Design a binder for these strands. Sequence first.
RNA 1: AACGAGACUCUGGCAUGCUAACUAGUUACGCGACCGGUCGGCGUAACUUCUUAGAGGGACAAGUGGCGUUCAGCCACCCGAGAUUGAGCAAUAACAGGUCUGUGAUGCCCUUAGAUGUCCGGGGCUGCACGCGCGCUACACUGACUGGCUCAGCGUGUGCCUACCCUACGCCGGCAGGCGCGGGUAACCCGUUGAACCCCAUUCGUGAUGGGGAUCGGGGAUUGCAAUUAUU
Lengths: 139, 144, 101, 72, 189, 66, 143, 57, 54, 56
Amino acid sequence: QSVQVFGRKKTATAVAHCKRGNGLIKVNGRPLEMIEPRTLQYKLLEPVLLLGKERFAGVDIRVRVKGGGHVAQIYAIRQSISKALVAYYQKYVDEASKKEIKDILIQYDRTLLVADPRRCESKKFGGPGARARYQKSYR
Amino acid sequence: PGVTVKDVNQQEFVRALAAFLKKSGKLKVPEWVDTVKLAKHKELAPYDENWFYTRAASTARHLYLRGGAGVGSMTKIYGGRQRNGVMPSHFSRGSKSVARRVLQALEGLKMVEKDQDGGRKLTPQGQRDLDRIAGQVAAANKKH
Amino acid sequence: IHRIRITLTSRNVKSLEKVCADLIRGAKEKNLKVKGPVRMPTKTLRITTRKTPCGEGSKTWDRFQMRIHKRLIDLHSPSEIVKQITSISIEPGVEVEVTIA
Amino acid sequence: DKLNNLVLFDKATYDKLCKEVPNYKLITPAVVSERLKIRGSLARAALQELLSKGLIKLVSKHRAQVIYTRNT
Amino acid sequence: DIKLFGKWSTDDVQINDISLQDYIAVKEKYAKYLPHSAGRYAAKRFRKAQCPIVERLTNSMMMHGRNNGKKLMTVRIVKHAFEIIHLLTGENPLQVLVNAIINSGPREDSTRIGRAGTVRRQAVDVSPLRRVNQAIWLLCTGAREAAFRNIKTIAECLADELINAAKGSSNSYAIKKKDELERVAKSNR
Amino acid sequence: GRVRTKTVKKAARVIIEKYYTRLGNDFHTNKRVCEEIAIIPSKKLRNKIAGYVTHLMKRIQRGPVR
Amino acid sequence: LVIPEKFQHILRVLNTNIDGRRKIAFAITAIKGVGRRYAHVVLRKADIDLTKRAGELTEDEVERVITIMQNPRQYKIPDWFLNRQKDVKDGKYSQVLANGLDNKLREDLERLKKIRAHRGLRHFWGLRVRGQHTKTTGRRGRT
Amino acid sequence: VQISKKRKFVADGIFKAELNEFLTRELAEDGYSGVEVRVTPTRTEIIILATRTQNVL
Amino acid sequence: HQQLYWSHPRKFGQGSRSCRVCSNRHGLIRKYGLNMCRQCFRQYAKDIGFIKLD
Amino acid sequence: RRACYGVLRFIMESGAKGCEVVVSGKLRGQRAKSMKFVDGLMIHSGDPVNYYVDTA
RNA sequence: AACGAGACUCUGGCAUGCUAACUAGUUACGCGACCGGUCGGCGUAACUUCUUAGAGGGACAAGUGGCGUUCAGCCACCCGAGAUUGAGCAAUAACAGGUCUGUGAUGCCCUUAGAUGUCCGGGGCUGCACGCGCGCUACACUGACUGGCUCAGCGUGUGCCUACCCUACGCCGGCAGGCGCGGGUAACCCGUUGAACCCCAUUCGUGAUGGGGAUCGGGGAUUGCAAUUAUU
Ligand SMILES: [Zn+2]
């Protein structure tokens, strides 16, 4: 009667809890509007401004999140909201509604279901970072 | 209509709590308020001459979100970036008496007490008025 | 006796895993409540040195590593039996530290 | 050339501030400083009384940007 | 259904040129709520044609060294510019963006051939993807260069060139470079 | 690019020549039989032999190979 | 925030031609011995708002901010603000202002030049005093 | 007093490095090969390898 | 010459530590309690167990 | 030359799949050359160097 | 046929599948607190999604379509976590490359008792008319300041000789610090590592300005046996 999925960017892991509820989506115990980078409030609200409030009216989402930064935790929250609603519709609704959710979520942006797998390369001696090298001189 | 501190943006909640603490009167404001910098990295004294009320508000709110903190954790909360000369910048801590004369100022309104684990946390009587003013700030933004 | 805790450490992993599997097998055959082999995180010991002995060429560094792997297995068993099955798993490289509650 | 501006209100420029500033369709602290030849703090603060006058609409308020338009 | 910054819609935006239709994004399904997308557009050649050109302008806004990572800084610069554009013109502020990208990119460049110090160039065509790439570069460096030591902010200085490139004026820095990049191009031909 | 060295091609040629009855067109059942016939040091070579075998079994239907 | 009329455009305090149209806290900075930090403390001790500029100040509040620069220790300004805390001659706590800063540090320097010390001689040759390296830097203005 | 786990495995190494280098310097002209240190709870056993052991004891 | 020669306080500093096999004082690895030279560590590294992986 | 050949023929008779003996120094004269006494197979690169080839 | 290339080894990415977790937890149940909400607040149980780390999977140019003497292979696309992750190791043959200042590696020579040994004390290695290199901070409005808000990952930590630490918390101090008082040989404590740009508000207003901080005059405090040629 409950779902637990994880969303993921560079280091962040937002883990969404979906049980049968009314529609209070909470990040770490606070609303989606009050989440502090409000420049990306629409980035947070994409999976509910896409599929409407009525497809979320039966669930209740308490998202916890830790790791990464601010932008990387926004892209982890919205991935776990999508991956939680899809798993709820697969586990307690039919496959057809899961398909009709998944095609709109994929059609907007595939990074609402598939993790972004790129991480930071390692620094090497000889330069300041992974690819860049120290300045050299002549004679 | 169950309002808690987390159901409102904190940047106005701190202003509301500072206005409530200022209007109470019985907050033990120290003697060196109009002379000090709040850390060793800030190059000027703060602009608002009532800075002690805003600081004593936000220390209490960080005791709402996680208690068990003391003057050492409050030094790490209110720490910033020290721009130092032609050497690169580094994170410097805050003060340990500006962050200590707020903590036993909140004891002056019996809003906090020293917990058994060592730091300081909120009393239930001090958890009353924080939620009261959270309701008072969540009830004055949607109607106007 | 509650909380007989066996601490197992080695630099390689296959021998440590072999000893840990033999210990939990030899404890489970005597019908004891055996908690699983928990795995504390792996610490890596890095030391990076210049390759050169003198200090001349093209600034080539080395990257040495020693990795230390650590397990615990916990037993709710009396003390007069536990000192038998650990004394027979004589394998090199793996170090045993037994503590009682 | 260097910019000589005025830190406080002038008698003549206060007439310029009160009648065509509600007739611009874009009022912003870096156009008022350029047109009426004032400093930025008069543009930042003297405009914020016109919101209380009810003569100028407020579009967007930000740290680094303030956008005012006229009503109707 | 999808409005950029929740307010500006895309259905009435009309690209003029056929040369830039397949390359300039949103009209239909590149409609996004925000320019921030964080997508792997540089993973292959020609893949960045399928990215929304609002994100193109945002990404080229942060060019100089003290602003090189700041994306949340430049997206609010573009958002605040899309208010000043709408105030100073009165229409949808995305049609003026494609009017500026259509107008600003050159259509005949000169390719450099010579020896060490000797320059004898020759005129060639311009691919329309390089036209889109060099449209946004001239726009963004015009906004950057005319806001440097000036009371004007970057949001006003971007908007007052993003309309002046749509109107084809020669006070904008962008069209001042395009007509000279074609003037020295015709001079060899 | 993706060129198979003499190890993959030599091993694939002998394992076709000796065990042609078990090999078909599926790469997966080719991999499950190439790890039961041969003793390959493991997977990233095992999947390269079994892929050239799966490209080499399709080449036998269309005629002989040299 | 109306048109001012009694606008003393130049304030002649302590033999210094300070600004009159800057802010009231950063106008006092233009005298020697007052930085941006000291003027804020004397203005908060004088109980004046710092929104105002320098030209609308009534002459009571003009003189009462100069008289807290001639003797700040009566007004609870502590000793760690002062320009010379423990003086070498009288041991007195004072904030040296513009007329006597040169007239004090000259005597501090030539005090070290009568003594024939490692620092006064280093000042007398014009080289660097605080132990910097002197090979590659400081080349500007030297011949 | 005990010691850290990071120190105990590094001090274990420098034992067998000095032991081996000492036995190299000692028995290099007696065909010495290496050592093998096995630690029991009773004792610590050191097994020397050599070509002709019977001319080493 | 009794309150003298080994008199000077060598309680810290660069010349109170030396390598444990070289007895040399420069380029010293004190980390994890090695206390070897940077050159003599590289000779005995595989004996200690520090393997070069990446 | 003779002393390296004796060792090399012993350690090839004893079943090693190949060996390599190098004696560097001033074995005759004042400029110092080297030698290279090699036989059989010998792997230099990769990870099997750790367990297949035995150096000293 | 042999070596080098490739294979190989470590690492990144995937797994609601397996193995198990009071030195990691989530969910649920009571209790408590403040208004069904909020708890990083307290104890029990279902269990491993999140955390750890082991085995085993998974990707092969395997599928489709083009081009290839229809060969080796190349290009595009579906399905996919993924359709070149990043390193390590690295031949034959050489160099009048560097290293005797890493070695109790070492040949010859020099010196060996007003010593070229070695200790002690004090200086110097930093010295400045000036050339030449690696860099840090900047020249500002995409900004400086003063408040407010909210997020990491790799690590290290009480030492044979050996003196020498990570530090929570209470008090006194503007502050640098000072007193006690606890924890931690560590997934048990610092530590939910309450990082900085970033984000949100106030002030400043294109000027050598509040940008920029060099160079200097006074104090105060730690480290040390010693701080003057400024240790910080
Ligand atoms: Zn050494």
